[PDB]
């Protein structure tokens, strides 16, 4: 919104792990999908820090499914890059793309392969 410092507060609480501040700020009409200079999204912050509670808080908050940073990466791509499996399943239940690739031109499969997490790849390989 106008003067989206509420975005800064929500993002800082998102990667800080402070949930009560997130509730307080959303009570103030803050934007659900506020973005920073590089294009990060709070769901990508959750993938960074692996907070399933905040994942579900953002899901009930109404976050987008294919958020892309300046590197054009979906949150599923970031998750496969890090390797939080349960977040990967709870994200793919919502119906995200399977065959996408960012500006780096790679699908999440070989990415999860190189990051050293076979679980993401074996879960994703069964899609249709």
């Amino acid at each position: 919104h106008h003067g989206s410092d509420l975005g800064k507060k929500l993002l800082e609480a998102a990667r800080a792990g402070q949930d009560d501040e997130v509730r307080i700020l959303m009570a103030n009409g803050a934007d659900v999908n506020a973005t920073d200079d590089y294009g990060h999204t709070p769901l990508h912050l959750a993938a960074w820090f692996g907070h399933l509670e905040i994942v579900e808080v953002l899901l009930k908050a109404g976050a987008d499914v294919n958020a892309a940073d300046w590197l054009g990466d979906t949150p599923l791509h970031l998750a496969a890059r890090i390797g939080h499996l349960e977040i990967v399943e709870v994200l793919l239940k919502h119906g995200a793309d399977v065959n996408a690739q960012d500006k780096f031109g790679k699908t999440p499969f070989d990415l999860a392969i190189d990051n050293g997490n076979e679980d993401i790849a074996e879960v994703l390989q069964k899609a249709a």
Binding site: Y38, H40, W48, D69, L71, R81, F104, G105, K106, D110
Partner: protein
């Protein structure tokens, strides 16, 4: 009227002074408008199977022992004029020069089918020219020459002092091979020799200390005025601009001044080229270097000069623009303020490391201070540069450093210890030209230990 055409010609010449031919003649039709407004937004590429050559003076320090700092300018101008002239007669694309070193590339804008032959012919012509000058003016100097072939990615980085350049491991290989070469002969690699057609002096040159050989031879006028003057400030500083207008060339010497080198250390392993080109990694490098550039805008950053960008490195100096002497000020605060400038450089790289996902970027920084000289090289082309013992000392001592540590010289250690900053003694490392030198680190057990 005609002054507009005069400044148009000046601006076009100044574009080609810092940035190559084909890209320039393509960018003046405003293929990209963001590029045009940046000239007040560009592209990067990566090409395979090209040739690169380096050449260094032998005994470069010795010829600069007790001179007048003016003979050096003249002789360098003569040598480099002959060299780049020979470049036009042999159709090879220059890149830049690093003090005592001159290097070029073959077929960089568009591939050429006989790049290797042109490059070796350049080597032979370099040998002929240097021997002719040696016999004429009677100074025994030599050129260590090295060549390599492979793949390299080309682009322009930064927004201040930006210059077209190329990057890959092949540059490091060629530099090291020239370091392993012998005077008077060209030190080649088998990668170059796979298509050599053996029309030359085949020898196997190996080190006396990896498939290598040695060959011994055989109303726009105000807008255009602003554009052109901005470009002039981009290539050369203000003091030289005002001193030059009443003369032909430039040269100056300072008995004392600082210098810092700073390079990203863990950037090498981040070269995954699974994507075609890997240009996004270098876009990120562009972002970081642009952050460094915008750092310069601070008001207290007036006495600090970014000399150039070396590959992915960063070279800065100070203590030279302060030509006006005021007795109510201490003439030794320039080194201090540059030391803080380094500190905020480290802080900014730390912040960027925090803000980027799943990678840490560490830096090595080396500090030195002492005498040096500054000058201008080209004509119809331009380049500002500095020379001296201190610059090579700083480059050496920075390479024998540790990441996230401010490696500092012993005399600079002396001048800085009494003013407050805290350091721990690291050790003593051999330096060519000066023997043993002591090393100190500004971080004080900042790690777990």
């Amino acid at each position: 009227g005609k002054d507009l055409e005069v400044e148009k010609a000046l601006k076009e010449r100044m574009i080609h002074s810092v940035m190559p031919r084909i890209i320039a003649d393509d960018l003046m039709k405003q293929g990209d408008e963001e590029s045009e407004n940046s000239v007040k937004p560009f592209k990067m590429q990566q090409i395979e199977e090209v040739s690169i050559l380096f050449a260094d003076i032998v005994g470069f320090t010795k010829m600069s022992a007790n001179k007048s700092a003016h003979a050096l300018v003249g002789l360098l101008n003569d040598l480099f004029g002959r060299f780049d002239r020979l470049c036009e007669e042999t159709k090879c694309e220059k890149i830049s020069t690093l003090g005592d070193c001159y290097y070029c590339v073959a077929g960089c804008p568009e591939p050429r089918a006989d790049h290797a032959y042109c490059c070796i012919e350049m080597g032979l012509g370099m040998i002929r020219a240097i021997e002719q000058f040696c016999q004429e003016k009677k100074e025994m100097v030599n050129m260590r020459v090295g060549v390599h072939t492979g793949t390299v990615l080309c682009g322009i980085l930064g927004m201040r002092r930006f210059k077209f350049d190329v990057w890959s491991n092949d540059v490091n290989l060629a530099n090291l091979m020239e370091q392993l070469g012998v005077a008077g002969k060209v030190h080649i690699s088998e990668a170059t020799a796979k298509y050599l057609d053996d029309r030359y002096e085949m020898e196997d040159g190996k080190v006396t200390e990896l498939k290598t050989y040695l060959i011994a031879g055989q109303t726009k006028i105000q807008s255009m005025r602003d554009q052109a003057d901005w470009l002039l400030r981009n290539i050369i500083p203000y003091h030289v601009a005002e001193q030059l207008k009443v003369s032909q060339t430039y040269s100056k010497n300072h008995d004392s001044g600082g210098v810092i080198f700073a390079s990203i250390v863990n950037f090498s392993e981040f070269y995954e080229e699974n994507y075609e080109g890997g240009k996004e990694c270098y876009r990120v490098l562009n972002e970081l270097i642009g952050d460094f550039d915008e750092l310069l805008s601070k008001p207290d950053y007036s006495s600090i000069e970014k000399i150039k960008t070396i590959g992915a490195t960063y070279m800065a100096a100070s203590g030279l623009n302060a030509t006006q002497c005021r007795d109510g000020s201490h003439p030794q605060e320039h080194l201090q303020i540059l030391f803080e400038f380094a500190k905020e450089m480290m802080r900014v790289v730390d912040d960027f490391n925090n803000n980027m996902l799943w990678f840490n970027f560490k830096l090595r920084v080396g500090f030195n201070h002492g005498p040096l000289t500054a000058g201008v090289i080209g004509t119809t082309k331009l380049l500002y540069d500095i020379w001296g013992d201190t610059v090579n000392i700083a480059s050496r001592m920075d390479t024998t450093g540790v990441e996230c540590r401010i490696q500092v010289s012993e005399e600079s250690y002396r001048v800085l210890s009494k003013m407050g900053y805290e350091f721990d003694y690291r050790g003593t490392v051999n330096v060519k030209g000066k023997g043993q030198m002591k090393t100190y680190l500004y971080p004080k057990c900042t790690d777990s230990g």
